[PDB]
């Protein structure tokens, strides 16, 4: 099978600038090459066919070029909405084969996280379980650390963490951290603390609530 090699797994630029992703065919595929954009959680969208022709609705900011074995997708005036994974594809030979995909990243200034903590809902407490949720929204860069303290004592058992992709509006990241306990163990303690360590501050951002 023809190997469509996208040399870079990640491509980076700033908003308003331009980015170019290359794709290397192992054999001459002429110009029978297509490009696809796939935003998170969405179906793939075709951008380019015949190496350099745009599908209807695709802005002129997306341009394709190349012939034979070397192909390039260029995104001009990049906006936060262009955050997606971009695949090259050859349809000159069977079977049709895609590239591995190049994920677009946007460079921006640092941003401290907005931290919110939420006690277990009275509805969940009827089930016998207790989840404490901490949202860490709109921060940059992605590297961040969250420590759960129960009455000033670190607790790392039962911590479920989830990170979003880069936000399609301001190019920031968000994180959700859930500490799940049993109902009886949650009522055996009082102080529940979510501490956020990020490079935007030497001191951790602290959010706490008392079960009373």
């Amino acid at each position: 099978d023809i190997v469509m090699t996208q040399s870079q797994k990640f491509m980076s630029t700033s908003v308003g600038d331009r980015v170019s992703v290359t794709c290397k065919a192992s054999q001459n595929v002429g110009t029978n090459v297509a490009w696809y954009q796939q935003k998170p959680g969405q179906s793939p969208k075709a951008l380019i066919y015949s190496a350099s022709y745009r599908y209807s609705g695709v802005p002129d900011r997306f341009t394709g070029s190349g012939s034979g074995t070397d192909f390039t997708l260029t995104i001009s005036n990049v906006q936060s909405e262009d955050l997606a994974e971009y695949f090259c594809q050859q349809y000159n030979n069977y079977p049709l084969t895609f590239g591995a995909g190049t994920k677009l990243e946007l460079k921006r200034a640092d941003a401290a996280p907005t931290v919110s903590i939420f006690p277990p809902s009275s509805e969940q407490l009827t089930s016998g379980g207790a989840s404490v949720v901490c949202f860490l929204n709109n921060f940059y860069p992605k590297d961040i650390n969250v420590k759960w303290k129960i009455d000033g004592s670190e607790r790392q058992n039962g911590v479920l963490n989830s990170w979003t992709d880069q936000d399609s509006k301001d190019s920031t990241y968000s994180m959700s951290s859930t500490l799940t306990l049993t109902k009886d163990e949650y009522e055996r303690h009082n102080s529940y603390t979510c501490e956020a360590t990020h490079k935007t501050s030497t001191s951790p951002i602290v959010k706490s609530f008392n079960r009373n």
Partner: protein, 216 residues
């Protein structure tokens, strides 16, 4: 309007078989090639095959010859991809897609994709819990915890889609054969708690639709 209609998800036991459906409408079903693409969780795209519904002519990726079988039903304008002897490697999202050139422009049309999960576990609907801030700023952050469901996916919206800005829906995490995700929305303090904010959660694999109001 041209539309490809796929079911959201399918849960099949290992070794069994499943028939993914792609219902076409709004165009001449027998005039364009029907394409099928597979995407494993977190992986890239793979081409399974294509079938021309006019005469059921097929091109198969040799990797999927014994696994996938493409048919069409012209009386209902529906394409079917049957997957047999299902294994864990077959758990993926399967897209149907077409490409229409009308003599002026070229448009692509994709189904939403069917999330196939190959597992022996049964269905579990999600528990939806409201995340209301502690007692007593110009903006207030609300939340929604969607816990303990299987299989993927679930759809989360706020006020039936009216609330879109300031929304952060986090990817689900698998723990103990159950999925859990969360969602947050940030709204003006003049909006909440003065107006209702509702977390709408749909889990098609269990026919579950829960609307959870965030009550102070």
């Amino acid at each position: 309007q041209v539309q490809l209609q796929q079911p959201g998800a399918e849960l099949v036991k290992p070794g069994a078989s499943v028939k993914v459906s792609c219902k076409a409408s709004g165009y001449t079903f027998t005039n364009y090639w029907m394409y099928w693409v597979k995407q494993r969780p977190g992986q890239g795209l793979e081409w399974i095959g294509r079938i021309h519904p006019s005469d059921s002519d097929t091109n198969y990726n040799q990797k999927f010859k014994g696994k996938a079988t493409l048919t069409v039903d012209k009386s209902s304008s529906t394409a079917y991809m049957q997957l047999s002897s299902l294994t864990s490697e077959d758990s993926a999202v399967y897209y149907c897609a077409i490409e229409i050139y009308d003599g002026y422009n070229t448009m692509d049309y994709w189904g939403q994709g069917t999330s196939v999960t190959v597992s022996s576990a049964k269905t579990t609907p999600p528990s939806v819990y409201p995340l209301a801030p502690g007692s007593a700023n110009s903006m207030v952050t609300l939340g929604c915890l969607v816990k303990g469901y299987f299989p993927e996916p679930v759809t989360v919206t706020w006020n039936s889609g009216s609330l879109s800005s300031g929304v952060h829906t986090f990817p689900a995490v698998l723990q103990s054969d159950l999925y859990t995700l969360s969602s947050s929305v940030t709204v003006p303090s003049s909006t909440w708690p003065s107006q209702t904010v509702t977390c709408n959660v749909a889990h098609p694999a269990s026919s579950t639709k829960v609307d959870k109001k965030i009550v102070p």
